[model samples]
Target: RWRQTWSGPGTTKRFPETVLARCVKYTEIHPEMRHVDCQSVWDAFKGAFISKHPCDITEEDYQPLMKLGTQTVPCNKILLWSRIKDLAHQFTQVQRDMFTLEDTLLGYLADDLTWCGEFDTSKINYQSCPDWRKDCSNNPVSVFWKTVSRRFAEAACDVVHVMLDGSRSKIFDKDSTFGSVEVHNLQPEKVQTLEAWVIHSRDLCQDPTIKELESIISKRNIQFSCKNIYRPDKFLQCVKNPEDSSC
Candidate 1:
C-alpha cells in the first residue's frame, strides 16, 4: 500500500474532499487516508484544545470533519519535492541490502517526490527536489521520462549479477552469445514490470507515443509480441467461445 501526505493548509476542507470525489469519479486511483492531525482544535473553540483522550474517528464522523477542514487557514505548500527525493534516495539504499523487490519499489514510491499545480491552472510545474530549477527540472513529460529511466536502470542493474551467476558466463567463453541467456530468461518478468510501470506512469498524464515506445524496446533488441494477443480477432474468438452447431 502507498500513502501520501498533503501538507498544505487547505488539505482538509478545501482540497481533500474535492480531490477525492474527482478521483473516485474519473480515475482508477483511490484515497486510503484522510485526517487532520494538526492544530485546528484551537480555532473551533478557544481553549477547547485541551482533551482527555485522543480521538479515534469512524467513517461517519470522518466525513463531517473533512467538510470542516476547508475553513482552516490557507498556506502555500513549502517542502515541495526536495525532502521527499532525499528520503527516497536514502531508503532505496536500505532496500538494496534487504534484497526485497517489494520493499525497494515501495521505498521509491514513499520517498520519490514530484509536484503538481494546486487549484486550477493552465500550466503545471514538475521537478525533482534540491536541483529543482536545474538539470532535473522540467515539465510533466520530461519529469515522467526521468522517473522511468531511473526505475529501468535500477532494475537492469539488480538483475545483472544474478544473470551473470546463473549463466556462468565467466566460466563459459566470453565471446559466445549463448552465455547471454540470462537476459533472455528475464524477459517475461521484465515485460510484466514494464507494463505495470507504463500504466502507472501514464496515470499522471504522461505517456509515450506507440512509435516512441517501440523504438525504445527495439533499441534493446526486445521485440514486443503481446499486442497481437489483444487484437480484435482474438478478442471476438474469446467472447464467442465454443462454436455452436445448432446455429
Candidate 2:
C-alpha cells in the first residue's frame, strides 16, 4: 500500500494547481517576475517531462522552463550555496539584498518538492518516482535543480557569493552541482570574484578541496576569496534555542 512513498512523501499532490497559483503569486509580488504570464510558465515546465521516464529527463528538456521563467537578477545579489542550506538561508534573510537560488522562480516553484512523469501519458506519476540519490542523476527533480543552478551561475555578474559547509571533513566537493556545474558556468569576463563563506568551518582556506576550487576558478582568470563565518551559525542555534543565555 505504501509503494511510492520513497518517491518522497508522494509527488507533491495538487502539483499543477500549486504551480499555477504560486506562479501567479510571484508574478504579483516580485517586480521582476511581474511581467511573466504564469500559464506559459506551466506549459514550458510541463513540456519538459510529460510522457517521459522521470529518470531519463535531461537538462536540455527543461531548457524552455528556465528560459520562460527566467528573471533579471541584479549584479552581486546572487548567493550560491551547498551543504549549508540552513545558514545560507539565514544569512540571506539577514542580509535582505542577497538572492539565493531558492529565492528565484524555478527554485521557488519547486522547493522541497518531488515529481516525475510516465512514458504513456503527460500526467504526473504520483505512484513511484525513481530515487535520484540512489539511482541515476537524471531524475526529474535532479535535472530541474541542475538546469536552474547552471542558468543561475551564468546569470551571475561581478562578485558572486557561495556559502559552503566548512565543518564537513570535505569542505568542498568537486563532484557537486555547485562545484562542477555552477563554478564552471560562471563566466570570467562577467564574474570578477567568487567569494566563499565557510560557516562553522573546520577546514582551512588551503585545504585540498578548497585549493582545487581556487585553482579551477583562477585558471578562469577569476579571483577567488574565502572567509569563515560564525555569527550565522549562532543565529541557527538561536533559532533552535531562543531563550539561551547567548541569545
Candidate 3:
C-alpha cells in the first residue's frame, strides 16, 4: 500500500520496452559494446530483484547484471556530481568532453526508469513499488544505483572531476552517494586528482565541509583540489540573459 509510480508502465510491461530500446541505443553508440545480449542483460537484471523483498536486494545481488552491462570508461573523462544533476549532465552532454555514470551502458539502461517485483513470484509489482528513501534504503532501486555508482567511482583514473552545488552552506556531504560510496570506492593510487568545481551556488574552496572531503581522500594520497567557478555554460547563461548572446 505504499505510494506508486503514476502514469507509468504497468506491471504488464515487466520486460520494459524502454529499457530494451535504451539497451539498443547504448550498443548503437558504442559499436564495440554490441556484444551485449539485451535479453540476457534483462534476465540478469530481473533476476536480481524479482522474487526478493525490496529491501533485501543488495549491491552484491546485482553482480550478474553489473557484469553484463560493464564497459571500460576512459581516464580523465569521468564527470561526477551530487546535487547538480542537470548541470552535470548538461555539461557532459553539450561539451561531449566527459563521461558520467549515466553515459555508461548500465546507467544508460536504468537512469529514469524504475521497477520492482513481487517477493514470491517472478513478476513485476505493477500496482506499486517501494520508495527509494521512504520505504527502505536497501530497496531494489537504491541498491542498483549504489552498485553502479560504486563501480563508476572505482573505475575513475587520472583527473576526477566533480561539479558540486556551492550555494548550500554544506557543499560537500559525506552522507551522499558521491561522498560516501564513490569517494570511499575510489582507488587513490590509480586516480591522479579529485578536482571539485563549486558551481553557481557559491564556491567555497576551503570550506570546512569540503576540507573534510579532502581529508578523506587525501589521506589515501589522491590529490584533492577545489575551485569556485561562475556560470561556465552558454545554455545556463542564456537562462539569465537570453538576448545578450547566442541564446
How much lDDT does each candidate structure score?
Answer: 0.26, 0.82, 0.80
lDDT of 3 by residue, 1-247 (tens): 4656533333445347777777888897798797889888878887898899876888888999988887888866999998888887876765467998888898888887677776788767777667655566777777889989988898889899998988876799888898879988888778989999887543378788988988888898999888887666765566545577465
What is the TM-score of each predicted model, taking all chains together? Answer: 0.21, 0.86, 0.86
The best candidate by lDDT is 2
Q: What ranges in model 2 sit over 4 Å off?
A: 1-9, 201-203, 233-247
lDDT of 2 by residue, 89-120 (tens): 77667546589998887788998777778788
Question: Which stretch of 10 consecutive residues in model 1 shows the poorest summed lDDT?
Answer: 73-82
Top-down TM-score ranking: 2, 3, 1
**True-vs-predicted CA distance for residue 217, candidate 3, Å:** 1.8
Best of the candidates, TM-score = 2
Q: After superposition, how far is residue 207 of candidate 2 from its true place, in Å?
A: 2.7
For candidate 1, lDDT tens digit of each residue in 1-247? Answer: 1423222111123322333343233222212213432233212211111121112112232223233333211111101111123332233343232222212222222122332332233222222121223422332222333333233233442122111111121222223221222223334333322221111101211223334434444556554321211132343343454354422
Q: How accurate is candidate 2 locally (lDDT)?
A: 0.82
Error of 1 at 14 (Å): 26
Supply every candidate's count of residue pairs whose N, Cα or C atoms clash at under 3 angstroms: 3, 0, 3
Which residue runs does candidate 3 get wrong by more than 4 Å?
1-15, 201-203, 234-247
